[PDB]
């Protein structure tokens, strides 16, 4: 899915899969690094930057 940023985040974007009623799961870190524990169902997927003193998730996508 397309996640764009109002500033430069520089590949510090991660993707998280949240299925209803559970803590989220990290899928891709560094914008291009598949996380070993949860490698690739249906759920809400949130992108998230880590470039900046404040960390910012995405709007949310079901």
């Amino acid at each position: 899915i397309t996640c764009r940023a109002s500033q430069s985040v520089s590949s510090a974007v991660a993707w998280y899969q949240q299925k209803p009623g559970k803590a989220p799961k990290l899928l891709i870190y560094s914008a291009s690094s598949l996380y070993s524990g949860v490698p690739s169902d249906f759920a809400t997927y949130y992108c998230q930057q880590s470039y900046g003193s404040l960390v910012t998730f995405g709007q949310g996508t079901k």
């Binding site: 974007v13 991660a14 559970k22 803590a23 870190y29 809400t44 949130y46 404040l54």
Partner: protein, 117 residues
């Protein structure tokens, strides 16, 4: 977690095991019903550095006793906006490897959540 009356002061306490809390960063992310995930605060519990979201501003304060492996998020002024499941996440320090690796960790050890209404 638990129930609080508007304008109260709650102390959420996240506890880790298997990784020393001073090595990493500890974040708190709330998720209200139907509003998705929303980042609140972070702390590097060795440098004591803390960051907060402009949303809370003054009320919340994140801390950590890096001698029992626990971090704490204490509230001070609450709303109906501050009601949601509060997750405890960890980012591991991103080492400065310019260009050659440049790995931006993402929380990989989320917390099982705790409900606060």
């Amino acid at each position: 977690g638990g129930l609080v009356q508007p304008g109260g002061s709650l102390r959420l306490s996240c506890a880790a095991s298997g990784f020393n809390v001073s090595s990493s960063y500890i974040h708190w992310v709330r998720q209200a019903p139907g509003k998705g995930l929303e980042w609140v605060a972070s702390i590097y519990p060795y440098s004591g550095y803390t960051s907060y979201a402009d949303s809370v501003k003054g009320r919340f304060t994140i801390s950590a006793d890096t001698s029992k492996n626990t971090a704490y998020l204490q509230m001070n002024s609450l709303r109906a906006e501050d009601t949601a499941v509060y997750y405890c996440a960890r980012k591991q320090y991103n080492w400065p490897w310019p260009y050659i690796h440049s790995r931006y960790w993402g929380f990989d050890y989320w917390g099982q959540g705790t409900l606060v209404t």
